[PDB]
Amino acid sequence: KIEEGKLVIWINGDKGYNGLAEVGKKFEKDTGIKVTVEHPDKLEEKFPQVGPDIIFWAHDRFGGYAQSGLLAEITPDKAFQDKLYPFTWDAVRYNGKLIAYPIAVEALSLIYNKDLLPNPPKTWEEIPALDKELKAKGKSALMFNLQEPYFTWPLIAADGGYAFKYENGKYDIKDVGVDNAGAKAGLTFLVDLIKNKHMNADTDYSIAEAAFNKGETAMTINGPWAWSNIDTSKVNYGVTVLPTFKGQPSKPFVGVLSAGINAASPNKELAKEFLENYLLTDEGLEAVNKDKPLGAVALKSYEEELVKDPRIAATMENAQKGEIMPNIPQMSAFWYAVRTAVINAASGRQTVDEALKDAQTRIKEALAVQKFFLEEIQLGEELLYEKGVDHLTNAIAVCGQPQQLLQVLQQTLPPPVFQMLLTKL
């Protein structure tokens, strides 16, 4: 339960929640206001029904919440806004409005074996000639997870690929950038690396991880979650900017850990105080970071301390150049479609032109049917009378797997018309 005059905060169990509680203790000591930090299971699933004053989560989940009116519009002090990197505020916009405070950023980087490769390539275009040189030493230039588009997208996006178009704190779900010239150029380059034997279509996460950590390949592409394993390996590794393609940066997907204020909270001013005046400060972020590292942070002054570790600076440089993950549920359709596209193209079964054509179709069709399905059901629920079993049957005709739906339809409402329903199937 939310109560006036205290704060309850949720953050996931993998983050520095004891450090966050220390910030909370400071806050309580100065203000008298009790701050309770929790890390519930399924917190991001529970928020919409019963939630706390403040929630910390990846920004992309917050679009759903905002679509439902569940987040307060944040109203940051004017000089404070300039204290965070501008691109981070773009991760916390929904329908043009600020709906959370950004805290930290995460993206892929290029990770390289400094002994094998003292001069990591600035361009993707250099990698074929480098691989040929390394192969003459029993080694390879690059291995990374080719199976998941999260990993291959940075290259595909570089010359102009994008998921959905972002402009003035909004995404246009009609404007999908999967089959444009830039996406084709990048996926062509990837496919070509494989046809020319510089990478293997079956390389996945485990295989690339083990190869880099055994000193068999000079580069991999991965995120901060992978550093600890490389530490154990003793490889003399560096983390740096991704190579450019056609003179443009690789654009990894960026996740931004963000803090949202519950629209239902009677403590919104206190939440702001906590977040702006206590948490998003050198001392506040230090407290969290000491407990469990935040990675690269949104607060410039503290990021400037953290980049003593050059790996953090690399995360940030790649994030600044990357594509913020769109905070809209239409992204689910993007991932399924592109995953297939890249696999088929990397295999040789489809042209690049054709795989990305399929993917763009898939995305358009899935979004249309999802809408159609809701719309047809709403005409359905206006049978209070029928009329709308034809509409219901239209919605059912669309579902590949209608058993689950047929169940609940037998509930609401009348068996005589469930009967009718059955007729049309």
Side-chain angles (χ1 to χ4, degrees):
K1 278 247 175 36
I2 287 183
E3 302 167 17
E4 187 167 353
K6 64 187 47 158
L7 294 169
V8 183
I9 305 185
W10 288 357
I11 189 166
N12 201 36
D14 64 350
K15 310 283 194 243
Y17 54 76
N18 291 327
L20 184 58
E22 292 294 311
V23 184
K25 293 318 226 208
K26 185 185 179 150
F27 187 76
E28 181 174 5
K29 178 182 130 78
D30 292 347
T31 70
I33 307 293
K34 168 61 148 208
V35 177
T36 303
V37 178
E38 306 180 325
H39 53 283
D41 284 328
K42 296 186 137 56
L43 77 83
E44 80 286 22
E45 299 185 17
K46 295 169 175 157
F47 180 71
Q49 33 264 14
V50 197
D53 296 274
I54 297 161
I55 175 167
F56 289 73
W57 204 264
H59 74 291
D60 61 327
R61 182 61 166 245
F62 292 177
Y65 304 162
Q67 190 42 53
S68 298
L70 300 177
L71 297 170
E73 186 177 32
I74 81 147
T75 69
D77 291 349
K78 184 277 205 339
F80 175 80
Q81 261 190 133
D82 290 346
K83 293 188 79 189
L84 317 192
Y85 297 98
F87 84 98
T88 69
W89 287 112
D90 285 318
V92 293
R93 285 192 173 108
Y94 190 84
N95 218 40
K97 293 148 53 57
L98 291 173
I99 53 69
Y101 289 88
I103 311 296
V105 315
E106 177 180 77
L108 294 167
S109 294
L110 180 68
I111 299 177
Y112 77 102
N113 184 323
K114 298 144 71 75
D115 298 337
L116 288 182
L117 182 60
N119 63 319
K122 293 293 191 184
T123 72
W124 276 96
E125 287 97 335
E126 284 164 274
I127 293 181
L130 172 65
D131 185 61
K132 168 161 176 175
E133 191 139 34
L134 284 165
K135 289 275 163 71
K137 304 173 182 185
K139 306 278 182 185
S140 64
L142 175 64
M143 305 177 64
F144 73 100
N145 186 14
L146 265 22
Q147 309 308 307
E148 286 295 343
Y150 182 85
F151 296 80
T152 53
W153 198 250
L155 173 58
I156 303 170
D159 186 52
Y162 55 88
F164 297 94
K165 193 75 190 298
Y166 175 81
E167 192 168 333
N168 38 60
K170 118 161 52 285
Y171 287 92
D172 180 356
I173 55 154
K174 312 175 83 58
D175 182 356
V176 173
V178 300
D179 77 333
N180 65 27
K184 287 164 182 182
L187 186 56
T188 293
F189 194 82
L190 176 62
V191 160
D192 287 348
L193 291 172
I194 300 178
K195 293 193 169 160
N196 295 314
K197 282 63 64 62
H198 301 305
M199 304 189 303
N200 291 332
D202 59 358
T203 308
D204 65 359
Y205 193 98
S206 291
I207 292 173
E209 182 175 44
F212 187 79
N213 300 1
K214 296 188 195 151
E216 306 178 345
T217 192
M219 294 178 283
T220 192
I221 291 173
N222 219 321
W225 59 81
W227 298 348
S228 176
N229 285 353
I230 315 189
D231 291 341
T232 297
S233 89
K234 306 298 201 215
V235 172
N236 176 28
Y237 78 100
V239 187
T240 194
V241 68
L242 291 155
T244 61
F245 172 66
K246 286 177 171 294
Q248 298 151 93
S250 287
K251 297 184 70 192
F253 285 114
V254 187
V256 176
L257 173 68
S258 302
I261 297 171
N262 190 329
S265 174
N267 299 307
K268 295 179 180 82
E269 182 54 55
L270 284 169
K272 167 179 165 162
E273 190 187 345
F274 177 77
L275 293 165
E276 284 189 32
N277 292 3
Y278 284 81
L279 179 60
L280 283 162
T281 58
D282 297 344
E283 292 183 12
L285 305 176
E286 167 66 21
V288 178
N289 188 73
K290 215 307 196 65
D291 181 13
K292 196 112 316 203
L294 283 164
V297 303
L299 188 71
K300 299 171 175 169
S301 65
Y302 191 62
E303 181 57 14
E304 284 168 0
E305 312 216 77
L306 285 172
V307 298
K308 283 173 135 66
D309 178 352
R311 305 170 300 167
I312 302 300
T315 303
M316 179 60 79
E317 179 172 357
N318 286 309
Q320 290 170 327
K321 284 162 178 183
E323 177 169 358
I324 290 159
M325 222 137 20
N327 59 358
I328 53 180
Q330 293 86 2
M331 280 300 287
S332 50
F334 171 92
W335 298 112
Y336 211 133
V338 176
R339 176 179 301 105
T340 295
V342 175
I343 274 148
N344 294 2
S347 94
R349 293 164 230 292
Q350 284 194 106
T351 177
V352 165
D353 205 36
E354 191 185 356
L356 297 175
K357 260 109 76 101
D358 180 65
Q360 182 106 2
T361 293
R362 280 331 188 167
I363 291 167
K364 297 298 183 142
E365 290 188 353
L367 269 45
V369 176
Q370 143 177 66
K371 173 118 272 306
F372 178 83
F373 179 89
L374 168 66
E375 292 180 344
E376 285 302 297
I377 288 204
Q378 274 149 359
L379 306 194
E381 267 156 353
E382 279 95 68
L383 54 32
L384 277 289
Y385 189 89
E386 137 65 50
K387 321 334 303 304
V389 153
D390 278 9
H391 281 311
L392 253 53
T393 67
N394 300 322
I396 291 156
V398 139
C399 246
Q401 324 289 129
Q403 172 196 338
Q404 249 43 20
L405 175 60
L406 251 3
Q407 290 179 41
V408 332
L409 257 30
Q410 110 186 349
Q411 299 2 291
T412 13
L413 231 20
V417 153
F418 193 73
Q419 217 32 68
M420 195 143 43
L421 180 49
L422 298 169
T423 336
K424 328 298 177 142
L425 299 182

